[PDB]
């Protein structure tokens, strides 16, 4: 409801974002062709998702800043900072799809698979990252939370890249890594790779924008939000295989890519010696036949039912965490986000 | 001489850099394996160059800060900031070698060509970038120039990535781009892709560290330094083909990659209609035979002699710029850098 309410305005602001980031073509003609490519990169990769991470910024901001302090310029800054989180996401996904050998994303071919793009997408991705800091400078430089936002985005990217490193190291191509696929390992990966940037970052940015900069307040928000991020990644892992691809807009690659997915960790905890062997012989390989055999094993082990039970226990746990740690922030900040991620099939 | 003098100390400080960036393994064991990979990435990609960009920071700092203000902590910060420029370089080269399909760098196989690395190097490269901002926080956060250094590194990366975009767009694989290879275009590419980060950034960082933050002073330094950066790129383009690879430590790919190199711009300005055709039929293609034919054309046109003449006229021009714009900074700041780049064969 609160997201549905704010969405249209958020998405509409994308035009101004594009306009301001391409406005340097005015004073420096010689970079015109690069700025044109930047616009095509933004249009292809920053649009077409759910905008949940960027919208969380705007939602939280409206709920945290006194309505009398929500003037036109203030709101424009909030939408800009929400867009910064979306640009960070677009940076990450462009590179990650290369790294994971993905085919589609958000209902279309991955940018790097477009003819004439290929590994040039590495540079495109990094330009998306650079745009975040240009927009923070253009819109927030004079604000008392400016440095806080800069350090928050830089720290989030570092933590996410630390997570991505654990993800890749635990998933080598061409090698059997079953021994490494543990619950403990899984939780560490997802905490770093997903939970910081997708959950703590947008809420913390709005906190800083509302002048809520206390260490204890940030640590209490973080306790709820990192646990929500872990659930979100487990659902992402479940959807990689069992999701509907016309809902998800992306084809799954976890089994082929030898990933430490929640599914494979659950499978391992439950496999007989013989099913372990089936997993061993079939996991982390490109053959469609071997990917099919893994999926058939998961289904044989009722993994979808185990996920649906996990979704329920996790929801309760997160709601207990909100009862404990939300104060003095409005619980609505966290509940609107929980509503948006739970029983979700995209 | 001044670089030779400062080098050993600079290189020795790399250990502390490594130590401090791996010190998070202490309090958070779960990221141990990522931190180990980060160390291997730093050791492979941040070592083995000339360290000129990082050393320029330390050299300029010593020449710009009153010797009475050069205490142990102050110097450690200068060496750390010099290392930040080297980490930025290592970030760029790792990604660029992927993008350019390079084979070797700094006398060894490119990191992404190592078995078991491949496109995981995209993430490695970005972690190198993240390390810059961790080191600025750990060492300079309490300093009045902290924000200035952050914005300078972020702005330099943006400008460099804008340059890289022009470079890629002007060099499409599989297509003839002769018409685009102009002097005007060339100068724009190199100004953005090379000159900002390799010349303006290290001197400007030391300026900010010395409390020299004036707009006019920065703009006067920049006039000298961007012209030096353009010469440096033209020499890099000449060395891609005519350099000795046991000096340069890298194999050239410009002709195969269809690059808007200074060599091809010079060739075009001088080619007969028939030599234009030779260039047209042979440029931007993987065949060793076609690369050989391009080189034979350049040699037929005395391009090495044209470069040696350009090196001399450019040196004079740069020295005229130093006579005009160095004040009130010591001309030694700029001359030590010119000495280090001119008549250079690495
Ligand atoms: C610099 C760049 C390489 O760093 C990163 C790029 C992407 C990511 C990242 C984090 C969390 N989720 C994703 N994508 C998901 P998705 O591919 O959308 O299902 P995952 O591959 O982990 O299953 C990517 C993290 C870091
Ligand atoms: C994010 C990343 C893709 O951005 C960049 C990566 C690398 C570079 C860059 C800039 C200047 N020189 C280089 N390398 C040289 P080199 O390969 O060392 O001869 P060039 O390919 O231009 O001839 C790379 C610029 C931007
Ligand atoms: Mg991935
Ligand atoms: Mg992926
Ligand atoms: Mg996934
Ligand atoms: Mg290049
Ligand atoms: Mg290159
Ligand atoms: Mg080169």
The answer, for B127 touching chain A at a CB cutoff of 8 Å, is yes
How far is the centre of ligand 1, averaged over its atoms, from the C-alpha of A312 (Å)?
25
- Cβ of B99 within 8 Å of Cβ of A147? The answer is no
Strand ranges (E), chain B: 104-105, 108-109
Helix (H/G/I), strand (E/B), else coil: A105: strand
Across the interface, whether the CB atoms of A165 and B123 are under 8 A apart is answered yes
What's the B247 CA to ligand 6 centre distance in angstroms?
A: 19
Spell out the SS3 assignment of chain A.
Answer: CHHHHHHHHHHHCHHHHHHHHHCHHHHCHHHHHHHHHHHHHHHHHCCCCCCHHHHHHHHHHHHHCCHHHCCHHHHHHHHHHHHHHHHHHHHHHHHHHHHCCCCEECCEECHHHCCCCHHHHHHHHHHHHHHHHHHHHHHHCCCCCHHHHHHHHHHHHHHHHHHHHHHHHHCCCCCCCHHHCCHHHHHHHHHHHHHHHHHHHHHHHHHHHCCCCCHHHHHHHHHHHHHHHHHHHHHHHHHHHHCCHHHHCCCCCCCCCCCCCHHHHHHHHHCCHHHHHHHHHHCCCCCHHHHHHHHHHHHHCCHHHHHHHHHHHHHHHHHHHHHHHCCCCCHHHHHHHHHHHCCCCC
Q: By C-alpha distance, which of A168, A170, A173 is closest to A256?
A: A173
Which of ligand 2's atoms lies nearest the C-alpha of B102?
A: 17
What is the spatial distance between Cα A342 and Cα B116, in angstroms, rounded to a whole number?
38
Q: Is A185 helix (H, G, I), strand (E, B) or coil?
A: helix
State the Cα–Cα distance between residues B294 and B245, nearest whole angstrom. Answer: 18
Q: State the first-to-last Cα distance of chain A, in angstroms, to the nearest integer.
A: 17
Contact status of A117 with chain B (Cβ, < 8 Å): no
The rounded distance, in Å, linking the Cα atoms of A91 and A86 is: 9
Q: Residue B222, Cα to own-chain centre: how many angstroms? A: 16
- With 0-12 / 13-18 / 19 or more C-beta atoms within 10 angstroms meaning exposed / middle / buried, residue A174 is exposed
Scanning the structure block, which residue is given the tokens 């000449």? B238
Q: Obtained via which technique?
A: X-ray
Torsion A9-A6-A84-A194 (CA) sign: negative
B91 counts as catalytic: yes
Contact B35, B52 (CB under 8 A): no
Pair type for strands A108-109 and B108-109: unpaired
- How far, rounded to the nearest angstrom, does the alpha carbon of residue B69 sit from its chain's CA centroid? 30
Judged by CB atoms closer than 8 Å, whether chains meet at B166 and A192 is answered as no
Q: Which two tokens stand for residue B79?
A: 């060496």
Distance CA A10, CA A7 (A): 5
Alpha carbons B333 and A293: distance in angstroms, whole number? 66
Name which residue sits closest to atom 11 of ligand 1, judged by CA.
Answer: A194
Please give the Cα distance from B45 to B88 (Å, whole number). Answer: 11
Shortest CA distance to A206 belongs to which of A63, A32, A15, A12? A63
Interatomic CA distance for residues B80 and A198, integer angstroms: 31
Indicate which atom in ligand 1 lies nearest the CA of residue A100.
21
Distance from the alpha carbon of residue B253 to the mean position of ligand 2, in angstroms: 12
CB atoms within 10 A of CB A219: 10
Is A134 a known ligand-binding residue?
no
CA nearest to B257, candidates B164, B158, B332, B132: B164
Residue nearest atom 12 in ligand 2 by C-alpha distance: B194
The answer to whether residue B95 neighbours chain A at the CB level (below 8 Å) is: yes
Fill in the DSSP letter of residue A211. T
C-alpha closest to that of A300 among A252, A335, A330, A263: A263
Kindly list the protein residues whose Cβ atom lies closer than 6 A to any atom of ligand 2: A 122-123, 126; B 92-93, 95-96, 100, 160-161, 164, 193-194, 236, 240
The domain that holds B317 is classified in CATH as: 1.10.600.10
d(CA B201, CA B57): 9
Alpha-carbon torsion (B293, B298, B304, B310), positive or negative: negative
Whole-Å CA distances, A257 to A92, A107, A288, B74, B236: 18, 21, 12, 47, 39
Alpha-carbon gap, residue A7 to A12, rounded angstroms: 9
**Gyration radius of chain B's alpha carbons:** 21
Domain coverage including residue B298? 1-346
SS3 content of chain B, % helix, strand, coil (to 5): 75, 0, 25
From the CB of residue B136, how many other CB atoms can be counted at a distance below 10 Å? 23
The residue among A272, A253, A259, A263 whose CA lies nearest residue A305 is A263
d(CA B124, CA B131): 11
> How many residues in total does chain B contain?
346
Q: How far apart are CA A160 and CA A148, in angstroms?
A: 18
What's phi and psi for A253, nearest 5 deg?
A: -140, 5
Residues B61 and B212: their CA atoms lie apart, in Å, by 11
Closest chain B CA to residue A41: B165
Pocket of ligand 1 (CB under 6 A): A 92-93, 95-96, 100, 160-161, 164, 193-194, 236, 240; B 122-123, 126
Distance of CA A200 to the CA centre of its chain: 11
Q: What is the DSSP letter of A336?
A: H
DSSP β-bridge partners for residue A45: none
Q: What are phi and psi of B323, to 5 degrees?
A: -60, -40
At residue B252, φ and ψ (nearest 5 deg) are -80, 150
Structure tokens given for B308: 């040696």
- Alpha helical stretches, state H, B46-182: 52-64, 72-99, 121-140, 146-170
How many folded domains does chain A comprise?
1
Written as six digits, the tokens of A293 are 């055999």
Whether residue A98 lies within 8 A of chain B, CB to CB, comes out as yes
Centre of ligand 6 to C-alpha B290, Å, is 20
């Amino acid at each position: 409801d609160v997201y549905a309410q704010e969405k249209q305005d958020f998405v509409q602001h994308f035009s101004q974002i594009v306009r301001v980031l391409t406005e340097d073509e005015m004073g420096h003609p010689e970079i015109g062709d690069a700025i044109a490519r930047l616009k095509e990169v933004l249009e292809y990769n920053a649009i077409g998702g759910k905008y949940n991470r960027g919208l969380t910024v705007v939602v939280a901001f409206r709920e945290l800043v006194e309505p009398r302090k929500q003037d036109a310029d203030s709101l424009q800054r909030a939408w800009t900072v929400g867009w910064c989180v979306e640009l960070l996401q677009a940076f990450f996904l462009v590179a990650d799809d290369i790294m994971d050998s993905s085919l589609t994303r958000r209902g279309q071919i991955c940018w790097y698979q477009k003819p004439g793009v290929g590994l040039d997408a590495i540079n495109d991705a990094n330009l998306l990252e650079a745009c975040i800091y240009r927009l923070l400078k253009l819109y927030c430089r004079e604000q008392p939370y400016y440095l806080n936002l800069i350090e928050l985005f830089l720290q989030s990217s570092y933590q996410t890249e630390i997570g991505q490193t654990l993800d890749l190291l635990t998933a080598p191509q061409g090698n059997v890594d079953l021994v490494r696929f543990t619950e403990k390992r899984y939780k560490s990966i997802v905490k770093y790779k997903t939970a910081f940037y997708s959950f703590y970052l947008p809420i913390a940015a709005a906190m800083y924008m509302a002048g809520i900069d206390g260490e204890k307040e940030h640590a209490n928000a973080k306790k709820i939000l990192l646990e929500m991020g872990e659930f979100f990644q487990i659902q992402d892992d479940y959807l990689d295989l069992f999701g509907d691809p016309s809902v998800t807009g992306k084809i799954g690659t976890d089994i082929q890519d030898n990933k430490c997915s929640w599914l494979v960790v659950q499978c391992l905890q439950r496999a007989t010696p013989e099913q372990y062997q089936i997993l061993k012989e079939n996991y982390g390989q490109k053959e469609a036949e071997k990917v099919a055999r893994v999926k058939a094993l998961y289904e044989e082990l009722d993994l979808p039912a185990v996920f649906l039970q996990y979704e329920e226990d996790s929801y309760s746990h997160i709601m207990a965490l909100i009862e404990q740690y939300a104060a003095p922030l409005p619980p609505a900040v966290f509940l609107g986000l929980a509503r948006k991620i739970y029983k979700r099939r995209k």
